[PDB]
Amino acid sequence: VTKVTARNNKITPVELLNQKFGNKINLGNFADAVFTDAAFKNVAGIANLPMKAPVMQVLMENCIVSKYLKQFVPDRSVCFVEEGQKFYIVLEDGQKIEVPEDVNKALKATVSDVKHWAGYLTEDGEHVIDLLKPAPGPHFYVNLLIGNRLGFKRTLQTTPKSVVDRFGRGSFRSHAATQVLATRFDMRQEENGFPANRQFYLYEDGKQIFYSALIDDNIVEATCKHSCNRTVIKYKTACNLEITRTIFLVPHKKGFPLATELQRIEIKNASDKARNLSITYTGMFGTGAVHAIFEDVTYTNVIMQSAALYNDKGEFIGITPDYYPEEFKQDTRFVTMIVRNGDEKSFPQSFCTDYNDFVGTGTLEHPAGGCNLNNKLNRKGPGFFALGAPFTVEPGKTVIIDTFTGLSSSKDNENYSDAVMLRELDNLLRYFEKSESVEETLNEIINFHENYGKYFQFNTGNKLFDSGFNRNLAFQVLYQTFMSRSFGQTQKGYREIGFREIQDLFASMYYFINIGYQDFVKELLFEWTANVYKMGYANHNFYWVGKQPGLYSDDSLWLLQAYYRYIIYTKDTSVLNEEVPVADGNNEKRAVRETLKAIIQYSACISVGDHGLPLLDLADWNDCLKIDSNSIDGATKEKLYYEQLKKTNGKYGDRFMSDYSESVMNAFLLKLAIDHLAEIATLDNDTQLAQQMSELSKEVTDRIQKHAWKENFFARVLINRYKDGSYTYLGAKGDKLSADPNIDGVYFLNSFAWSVLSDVATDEQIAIMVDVIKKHLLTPYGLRLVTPADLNKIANDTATGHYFFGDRENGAVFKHASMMAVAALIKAAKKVKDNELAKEMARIAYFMIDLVLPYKNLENPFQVAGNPRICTQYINTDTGENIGPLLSGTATWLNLNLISLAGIEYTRDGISFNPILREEETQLNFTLKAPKCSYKFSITKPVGFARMESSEYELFVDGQKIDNTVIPMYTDEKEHIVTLKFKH
Amino acid sequence: VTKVTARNNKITPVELLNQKFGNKINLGNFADAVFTDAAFKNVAGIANLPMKAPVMQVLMENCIVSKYLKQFVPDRSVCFVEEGQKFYIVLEDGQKIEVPEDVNKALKATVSDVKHWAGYLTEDGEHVIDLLKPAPGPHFYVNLLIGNRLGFKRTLQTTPKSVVDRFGRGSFRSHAATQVLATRFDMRQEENGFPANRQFYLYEDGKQIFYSALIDDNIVEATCKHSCNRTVIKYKTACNLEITRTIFLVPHKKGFPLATELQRIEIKNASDKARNLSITYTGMFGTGAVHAIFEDVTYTNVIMQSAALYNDKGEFIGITPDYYPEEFKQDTRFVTMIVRNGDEKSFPQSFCTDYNDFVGTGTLEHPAGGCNLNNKLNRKGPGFFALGAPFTVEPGKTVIIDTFTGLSSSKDNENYSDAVMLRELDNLLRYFEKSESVEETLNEIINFHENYGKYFQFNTGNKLFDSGFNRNLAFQVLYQTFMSRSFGQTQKGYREIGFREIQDLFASMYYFINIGYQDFVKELLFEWTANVYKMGYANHNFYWVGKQPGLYSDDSLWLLQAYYRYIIYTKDTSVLNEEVPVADGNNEKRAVRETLKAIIQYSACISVGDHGLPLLDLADWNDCLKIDSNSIDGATKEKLYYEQLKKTNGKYGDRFMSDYSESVMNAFLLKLAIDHLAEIATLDNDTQLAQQMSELSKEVTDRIQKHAWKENFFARVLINRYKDGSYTYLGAKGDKLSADPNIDGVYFLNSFAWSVLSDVATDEQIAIMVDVIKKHLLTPYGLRLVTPADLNKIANDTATGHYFFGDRENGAVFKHASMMAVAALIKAAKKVKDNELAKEMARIAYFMIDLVLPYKNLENPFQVAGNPRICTQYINTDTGENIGPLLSGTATWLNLNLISLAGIEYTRDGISFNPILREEETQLNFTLKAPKCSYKFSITKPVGFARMESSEYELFVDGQKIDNTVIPMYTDEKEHIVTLKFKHH
Ligand SMILES: OC[C@H]1O[C@@H](O[C@H]2[C@H](O)[C@@H](O)[C@H](O[C@H]3[C@H](O)[C@@H](O)[C@H](O[C@H]4[C@H](O)[C@@H](O)[C@H](O[C@H]5[C@H](O)[C@@H](O)[C@H](O)O[C@@H]5CO)O[C@@H]4CO)O[C@@H]3CO)O[C@@H]2CO)[C@H](O)[C@@H](O)[C@@H]1O
Ligand SMILES: [Cl-]
Ligand SMILES: [Cl-]
Ligand SMILES: [Cl-]
Ligand SMILES: [Cl-]
Ligand SMILES: [Cl-]
């Protein structure tokens, strides 16, 4: 027998359709087709579509169209064409047949409004989704909900999180990986939680009439609206019932449970007769023993039981899972339902806690015993629950069912027990007793996200871009600040906060400082500083305590940048005098200034190679550069360094002698950190520290220029363990490590990016690297992270690849690295003397940005996939599809790059205004919010590239023409108008 | 807010029903009831049931009965009675109302044949299951299928395994934990695999008319038959279609793939018109990366793609998943379908590889695009597949569809690639060309399991018991021998071939030797010996490499028992000279005799406490007895021991100094192992080794008697970490660790069991422990593992800190320990001088055995649950329900105990015949198979307890009266008749 793989099957159905019907009929710009047999010999398709979409699959789903095609296409290729508001079928020989009336009507109904199959964005950036249409990708219809723990202890650790899809499915997690609602670990990416989560059934006269997760013939229409931190789903039934589901997380208040999710279900009777209905709201509680799911499911089943909750009057209100082991009793989950028939409150009358009894002989969509629950408390088994209550809806009236699903944990209370959970649940119910109290709360949430994003507001003509930046991007930045990369649709494992993820604070801090939360930023900075050891290395990960000390060499170097930004924006040098505990433990504390000095010393003097550049250790920012197999972490290096100092009678601060490889990206980060520390010391009136840092920066720049430049590019890694000269460097021409014969040597994008960002490369070097990038690193789908390389020559311990071409580490475009490169390009374009080079760099930057903006994913949704409101991780270079977890460094650097392109940069003297606009753009207006004032920026230019470095410009501030390009930070609590005019 | 747990809700619906309607009506022996509201105030029920059953749930499922009840359920309790073949409803005030005609008819239909709701057992032990009835438990409708790799390299590691429920759902596994069909790791125990596995859809004229996993109005009846190593399911449709599914694992032949599962679907048209139907067979392959399902599913999705398979004629035949990484390219999966329309053969015409495209806007039960497949090869994603083919069925004719789902691995071929898979698949397809061949294969399987079990055959009057022992129990023992506790209905991961699971070979070996597979027994023994390190500790689990070295102390001590059994039965001492690689790695190889000596030394001299007993090492056989919190494994102990020897100027074999706790069960196991090794050395003409082992056994017995006996029982654990004397021992009177104020101390069943089994306890001690067991450890549901304890005062993370009382190790009836105790009771009853004590012990043993036999689970199926053909793990003492995985040592020790009760014990001089029969039994006939002969045993006795120790008996062999009670192992290739007759006083 023979095998034919998916990628080896070169001929696609669309290509075969074009071959067969290319000259006979006009196929238009887009067409769809499908193979009619496993032999891939005949095709069936429809032509002249507005955009690429799986129309053929939907057509085959229809019974009438399938039956009509059955008589035509078991072995004969056919095509569908539209002429004169009628549908014809064209055969391969040339006959055109007018289809009968029913199939013509079905085709007209299906083809209508193809352009909105994936949905559309409103003027506020909200995504409107039809529930009957296919999904472009697993992450396309996903929304992320967040809590609000501001003003409370351990904000990062204890913030609740949730993921909700278009049907309301998903999951809900408390601190760390604690699950309130069950998370499903299955083979598909679409299944994130248990199917019964946040779903309910509506019965009438003992007969099921509605299921929230099923669209039967009884539903005329059903739409979902994804917004910022809330989800709204609307159903309309054929029996004149309007159902509205609103899902959101409750912001934390004093005495509330640690995590709480609220779902409000409004049922309106549009008919003229009273309806006696019943509602059954189902769900499944998450387990406390996550590892036992793989190890022993029976262990998870037998260690817990079900319990009922009764209010002060002895009325049943909800179900909780009760655990026997003492360790699993530190978190207590609950679910509660309240029915409001206007101003009258009622509670569920029946419950079920057994999945088998509930489903019976039917399925989850049509439970056999879903109407009459047995009211039996299960002695074991998973925390499945179903609460049932009857009600009556008068003609034209509405009934509101509020469901609270939550968890109370010991991480927020002392002497924790179930009594604490009961008290907190009582407080929550008492707070939400009134019907309006829920609605107001929702408004509060909206107002928060309508204010947090007011730091930077765009006012361009394109409403989609303005909504995407002002609302969606700011929310994503806040979400990544609060959660880093610990949750998502496909990010279901347990993850701790990485040190490098402090990059998320680079963009979000300016928002927080502008809503009166500067102390929160200070607390985050101190929390990150507490994970730095005395020597200078830092813990790689930390959630409650740090771990992996000094595993990666580039971690601590990031911290400096963050501090710089803060001190630049607020002029608050007092943070330098704060005493923070060191990561070594015991009870020792150190000043922040001394910690920064130690961080600089650990990479500038100690832990350096033969060339004086920082050591690679296990790996730098890039986790694939595992060149050194015998690498050591911070603790082992410190012990060996102390032994060496004792043996050789050396002095502290001398080089740690070894033959490990050197990292040049770490050198660029070190140079940037040294410059930032010099600037901070200058701002702190510490002349000697500033002068020392300036001399150290000059020396490091000289070392980098002498040992890293290789006449064509900046080398990535310097190798010292080969004394015969077989291999000395990696990441430049002539390194003899390229896996592609057509490429002279390996090239790394980060080398150029951080050579420009650290202000090390000169103009000639910048031009040379730009030419090299255009030649090799530029692809039709973006910028590659690195050209193909063969690291087995130097590191034989490296294994083979794990991905097909175009996936992740096999040629994909990682949008985080591409965004850093775009930031470098924007920075270079503002200062290079050559105007043509600046124009080319700006063009490349805008081209790369246009491939990352989420709102542009709706132009060709069924080819690029992704998400129209949330940035994805990488782009598959073989197909162009946006793939990856919804949480990554893409959002932060995209926000920073857009702000920089607007021309806003913060320096010691204030705001260095220097915009770079698109060639076609002729007007750019935006509003900037400052702690003590505000600015309204307007920029006007003719068509074509323009910048103040070369073009002629007039600048006015408050109606007064000025020559300096630095705008001072006013403190008069007024709005200042800034106007820029470019003259041809 | 107030919280009320399930266990704190003392009142039950049946109790409330009895309270409300106890005197007004006759509730009979049984009744069913259900609360009508969450307040637990009123009840709705039905009386006079033949047995406990969820009748009320079925009634509320019915629309008519629910509608009739709805008028007065929330407010007042109601009961259903049947008088004069007509149903009446009784209220709490005494009113009796005749139900309407439709309600009466529905009630009559529902309450008919309640006795067979859980099914019944045929004459051959096969289980017949109705697919429209509720399941008593998650393990009640489960069957296990095993392959056959005998006569091929690395049999133990390469035998395929499968789990099939009543609907055919489950997962199919291969060598080690390699998944062929996807296994589902979810919250529920009932979901073992992906829901689409082994299921198919039948369409007619573009409309779905049949789904194999769904029972709807179109299905008149649907039954499943669970048998030995195959499953048969039958559906009958309202449109006169008969569908038969036969599922079994293909025995391995030369050139075949490593694992292959065959499902045959026969569709017969009972009408008088030809029908044009279409079949869509769906499934989902397992992933090579079993991990990263819990880390990142995207990685699992993007490292693989789909591929189509074409025969030599260029016709599509099936789908295979193709992986990029070299790590996952060592195993290649495939699925293929063949349609036999009498003599004509056809292949599937369409396929789908995307779950979203297949399901579409519908569900898995009613896929939107299940009839018209897009024929698109998915570039990524999980290996979902659906093969579709049309066919025409003539009136009265049958159409067969054969589906082969398999995996080919590099563990059986060299220079492996996908070409090897293609060649093996071609060979497999060539073998199964004729339609009859498949049937023949099935017969072969049956014949194997009809012969493997002929080693010991019962011939009693009770047909159910004979079918359960001769057929079901032997198959379960074989399966557990090949699989330990690795793969089952709920055993799905983290567990490999366990070292102590060598206990299974205690029972199955006699079968293998009797089918000419003694070399396979030797291979198994060497495979287990290969996981023993030089010092003596052993790997806890192993598939191809070991893991958890020396984590548990009780391991490596059952190897001595296994070797003793094999050598005694076969008189083959040559296995002592075999060179087996050690678990330390490198290339060192040691003789088996030296390995046994090292095992004895590691527990007799090294790794002993202050009293000279073996250390606990965080757990003995009892996995939840984690007394020591600062425990260490074998490697750390070895390093520390070598450092201590170097620093203190010691010599190898000295005690490893520490203050860890001591295990007395390990001491009993060590004493038994030393006795077995002494006997083996005596049989091997190794005089000085035998004398040394005898002296060591005497010394160990003296130590146990001096330090473990506590004047009321045998202590379980000796504690040495408390120098103030607050706690010194656990498992006897006066240990100050009892959680029950009415019980002086904690008591462990294993202490008595292995004191009797190891021949350490005396007759007076046996009587004292029997009295203690009857006072405390005897429960209506059997012998509980341990009395209530308060171990949290000395150590957390114990059994008492994990489970509710009455679950697993926390005082439940752990049937493995119960069977070991029954074995001890049987052994004691054959030799104690006191006849009354022996009678009581035999009565207790038979009482405990009656609670373990699977076939008795059908007497009260909806209360005891369990499985009518496979032994479960434990019994909950609060409810009596049989819970736990289908894999346990319960089956092995039940087989051993039932053989021992017949009197078959193998000694060095032959068979030590000494039967112990039931008091009410008066006749016992069975047949025994020997390597060079066979025996037919017949035993006759009057009613009442009788044994050769006290009762008068006559024994005849081949019609010759003899006095010696040891039957020699003849070698004349004939059948010998043995007759025993007991005479009353
Ligand atoms: O002698 C017994 C007999 O039967 C079998 O042995 C069984 C035994 O019968 C079972 O009782 C035992 O049950 C264990 C579960 O299998 C295992 O999954 C569970 O693991 C727990 C662990 O005990 C607990 O400490 C752990 O807590 C961690 C949390 O998960 C984390 O969140 C937290 O951060 O860290 C803590 C660690 O402190 O949870 C896991 C579950 O996730 O432990 C049960 C009791 O030990 O299983 C035995 C088999 O393994 C056996 O087949 C026979 O051979 C044997 O003779
Ligand atoms: Cl995600
Ligand atoms: Cl890099
Ligand atoms: Cl025990
Ligand atoms: Cl099982
Ligand atoms: Cl067990």
Residues A919-928: contacts with CB under 8 Å, at least 24 apart: A919/A843, A919/A943, A919/A944, A919/A945, A923/A460, A923/A461, A924/A460, A925/A459, A925/A460, A926/A456, A926/A457, A926/A458, A926/A459, A926/A460, A926/A902, A927/A456, A927/A457, A927/A459, A928/A455, A928/A456, A928/A904
Residue from A21, A19, A14 nearest A90 by CA: A21
Residue A413 CA to its chain's centroid (Å): 31
Residue type, A963: D
The bridge status of strand B78-82 relative to strand B87-91 is antiparallel
**Measured between alpha carbons, how far is residue A45 from residues A5, A775, B461 in Å?**
23, 39, 71
Residues B79 and B327: their CA atoms lie apart, in Å, by 64
E-state strands within B550-673: 579-581, 589-591, 662-663
3-state secondary structure of B792: helix
Contact B6 A135 (CB under 8 A): no
CB half-sphere exposure, B230, CA atoms < 13 A:
20
Alpha carbon distance B757, A87 (integer Å): 87
Q: What are phi and psi of A159, to 5 degrees?
A: -80, 125
DSSP character at residue A394? -
Going along B414-531, which residue ranges are E strands?
Answer: 456-458, 497-498
Instruction: Determine contact, residues B260/B249, Cβ cutoff 8 Å.
Output: yes
Contact B192, B163 (CB under 8 A): yes
CATH assignment of A910-983?
A: 2.60.420.10
Strand pairing class (A934-940; A975-983): parallel
The Cα–Cα gap between A919 and A847 comes to 12
**Contacting residues for B539 by C-beta, under 8 A, at least 6 apart:** B499, B531, B546, B547, B548, B549, B555, B583
Complete DSSP assignment for A836-854: HHHHHHHHHHHHHHHTT-G
Report which of A116, A114, A109 is spatially closest to residue A130, judged by C-alpha positions. A116
The distance of B429 to chain A (nearest Cα, Å) reads: 10
Cβ burial of A601 (10 Å; 0-12, 13-18, 19+) is middle
Contacting residues for B803 by C-beta, under 8 A, at least 6 apart: A302, A303, A324, B809, B810, B812
Backbone dihedral angles phi then psi of residue B490, each to the nearest 5 degrees = -110, -15
**Tokens standing for residue A261:** 């999710």
Cβ neighbours around B276 below 10 Å, total: 11
- CA–CA min distance A363, chain B (Å): 8
- Chain A CA closest to residue B322: A5
Nearest to B93 by CA among B79, B81, B107: B79
Please give the distance of CA A358 from its chain centroid, rounded to a whole number.
Answer: 37
Among A699, A229, A143, A605, smallest CA distance to A453 is for A229
Report the atom number in ligand 1 closest to the C-alpha of B619: 1
Contact (CB, 8 A) for A980 and A924:
no
The rounded distance, in Å, linking the Cα atoms of A156 and A171 is 19
Quickly tell me which residue has 């023949």 as its tokens.
Answer: B440
Residues of B in contact with A369 (CB under 8 A): 57, 60-61
Q: Which residue has the tokens 């005609």?
A: B101
Helix (H, G, I), strand (E, B) or coil at A832: coil
User: Which residues in chain A are contacts of B811 at CB distance < 8 A?
Assistant: none
Nearest-Å Rg of the Cα atoms of chain B is 31
Rounded to the nearest 5°, which phi and psi values hold at B83? -130, 130
Cβ of A187 and B207 within 8 Å? no
The two three-digit tokens of residue B25, written as one number: 């009506």
Angle separating helix axes B889-901 and B835-850, nearest 10 degrees: 140
Best substitution site from A174, A179, A185, A291 to test ligand 1's pocket, by max atoms within 8 Å of Cβ?
Answer: A291
**With left for phi above 0 and alpha for psi between -120 and 50, is residue B5 left, alpha or beta?**
beta
Q: What DSSP string runs through B917-946?
A: --SS--EEEEEEE-SS-EEEEEEE--SS--
β-pairing verdict for B331-341 and B398-409: antiparallel
Q: Do B322 and A57 touch (CB under 8 A)?
A: no
Inspect the interface and report whether the beta carbons of B63 and A206 lie closer than 8 Å: yes
Contact B247, B164 (CB under 8 A): yes
Q: For residues A862 and A133, what is the distance between their CA atoms, to the nearest angstrom? A: 12
Measured from CB, residues less than 6 Å from any atom of ligand 1 are A 289, 291-292, 295-296, 299, 327; B 485, 498, 500, 621-624, 797, 802, 808-809
B324 and A802 within 8 Å at the Cβ level: the answer is yes
Paired strand residues for B498: B541
Show the tokens assigned to B238.
């309202």
Residues 6+ apart with CB under 8 A from A732: A710, A711, A712, A713, A714, A715, A716, A745, A746, A747
Is the CATH code 1.50.10.10 the one for domain A751-897?
yes
State the Cα–Cα distance between residues A734 and A851, nearest whole angstrom: 32
Please count the helices (runs of H) and the strands (runs of E) in chain A. 25, 48
Nearest ligand, CA B629: 1
**Hey, which residues does B967 pair with through a beta bridge?**
B911
- CB contact under 8 Å between B302 and A375, yes or no, is no
CB A569 within 8 A of CB A509: yes
Which residue is associated with the tokens 């920026």? Answer: A937
Handedness of CA A459, A460, A461, A463 (dihedral sign): negative
Name every residue whose Cβ is closer than 8 Å to that of residue B261 and which is 6 or more positions away in sequence: B145, B160, B162, B172, B180, B181, B247, B248, B249, B250, B404, B405, B406
| Domain layout of chain A by residue ranges | 13-111, 120-449, 528-708, 751-897, 910-983
The span from the CA of B716 to the CA of B663, in Å, is 6
Q: How many CB atoms lie within 10 A of CB A466?
A: 19
Judge whether A615 and A609 are in contact, CB under 8 Å.
yes
Nearest atom, ligand 1, residue B887 CA = 52
Q: Which of A61, A185, A303 has its CB closest to that of B294? A: A185
Residues in chain A with CB shorter than 8 Å from the CB of B207 are: 63
- CB contact (8 A) between residue A363 and residue B360: no
Q: A129, A223 in Cβ contact below 8 A? A: yes
User: Which H/E stretch holds residue A180?
Assistant: strand A179-181
Rounded CA-CA distance B611/B659 in Å is 11
How far does residue B191's CA lie from ligand 5's centre (Å)? 11
Q: Helix/strand/coil (H, E, C) string of A220-236?
A: EEEEEEEECCEEEEEEE
Structure tokens of A430? 């008492």
CA distance linking residue B963 with residue B974, whole number of Å: 22
* Phi/psi at A333 (5° precision): -100, 155
Which residues of chain B are within 8 Å of residue A184 when distances are taken between CB atoms? 186
**Does B294 sit within 8 Å of A492, measured CB to CB?**
yes
Multiple choice CATH, B120-446, 2.40.30.10, 2.70.98.40, 3.40.50.360, 2.120.10.30? 2.70.98.40
Residues forming beta bridges with residue B13, ordered by sequence position: none
Q: Using an 8 Å Cβ cutoff, are B479 and B146 in contact?
A: yes
The closest of B974, B966, B968 to B933, measured between CA atoms, is B974
Nearest CA in chain B to A74: B349
| Chain B environment of A429 (Cβ under 8 Å) | 1
User: Using N-to-C axis directions, what is the helix angle for B558-570 and B664-683, rounded to 10°?
Assistant: 30
- Determine the Cα–Cα distance for residues B130 and B117; give it in Å rounded to an integer: 7
Closest Cα to atom 49 of ligand 1: B623
State the nearest Cα–Cα gap between B382 and chain A, in angstroms.
6
Report the CATH number of the B713-889 domain.
Answer: 1.50.10.10
DSSP H or E stretch at residue A284: strand A275-284
Question: Using an 8 Å Cβ cutoff, are A258 and A159 in contact?
Answer: no
Minimal CA–CA distance to B731: which of B787, B777, B771? B787
Residue B433, burial from CB neighbour count under 10 angstroms (0-12, 13-18, 19+): exposed
**Residue B348: closest CA among chain A residues belongs to which residue?**
A38
Max distance between CA atoms of chain B, in angstroms, equals 95
* 3-state SS, residue B224: strand
Assign domain B530-708 to its CATH architecture.
Answer: Alpha/alpha barrel (1.50)
- Cβ atoms of A359 and A367 within 8 Å: the answer is yes
Quote the CA–CA distance of A262 and A248 in Å, as a whole number: 6
Tokens of A45: 């398709």
Closest ligand to C-alpha of residue B786 is 4
Element (H, E) at A975: strand A975-983
In B410-545, the DSSP E strands lie at 456-458, 497-498, 539-542
Give the contacts of A595 (CB within 8 A, at least 6 positions apart). A529, A532, A580, A582
Collapsed DSSP state (helix, strand, coil) of residue A936: strand
What CATH number does the domain located at B911-983 have? 2.60.420.10
Q: Compute the distance between CA of residue A68 and CA of residue A99 in angstroms, rounded to an integer.
A: 9
- Measuring CA to CA, which residue among A298, A301, A306 is closest to residue A353? A306
Task: Specify whether the CB–CB gap between A823 and A900 falls below 8 A.
Answer: yes
d(CA A709, CA A697): 17
CA dist., res. A502 & res. A519, Å (int): 16
Sequence-separated contacts (24+) of A12-18 with Cβ below 8 Å: A13/A43, A13/A45, A14/A45, A16/A40, A16/A43, A16/A77, A17/A43, A17/A45, A17/A47, A17/A77, A17/A79
CATH fold group of domain A120-449: Beta-galactosidase; Chain A, domain 5 (2.70.98)
**Per-residue DSSP letter, A391:** E
Pocket test residue of B185, B541, B623, B716 for ligand 1, highest count of atoms within 8 A of CB: B623
**Are B7 and A808 a contacting pair at CB < 8 A?**
no
- CATH fold, domain A528-708, is Glycosyltransferase (1.50.10)
Q: What kind of experiment solved this structure?
A: cryo-EM
Cα distance between residue A784 and residue A811, in whole Å: 6
- Region of A799 (left: φ > 0; alpha: ψ -120 to 50; beta: rest) is beta
In the block, tokens 């074998």 appear at B634
**B596: DSSP letter:** H
CA A791 from centroid of its chain's CA atoms: 31
What is the Cβ-side half-sphere exposure of residue A214, based on CA atoms within 13 angstroms? Answer: 24
Query: Checking DSSP bridges between strand A662-663 and strand A717-718, what pairing results, if any?
Result: antiparallel
Closest approach atom of ligand 1 to CA B485? 52
Whether B530-708 and B713-889 share one fold: the answer is yes
Which has the closest alpha carbon to B183: B544, B407, B491, B543?
Answer: B491
In order, the DSSP letters of A554-598 are: THHHHHHHHHHHHHHHH--GGGGG-EEE-TT-TT-EEEHHHHHHH
* Alpha-carbon distance values, A641 to A215, A662, A720 (Å): 67, 17, 19
In the structure encoding, which two tokens stand for residue B45, read together? 């029920």
- Return the C-alpha torsion angle B76, B80, B84, B85, nearest 10: 140
Strands A579-581 vs A589-591: parallel, antiparallel or unpaired: antiparallel
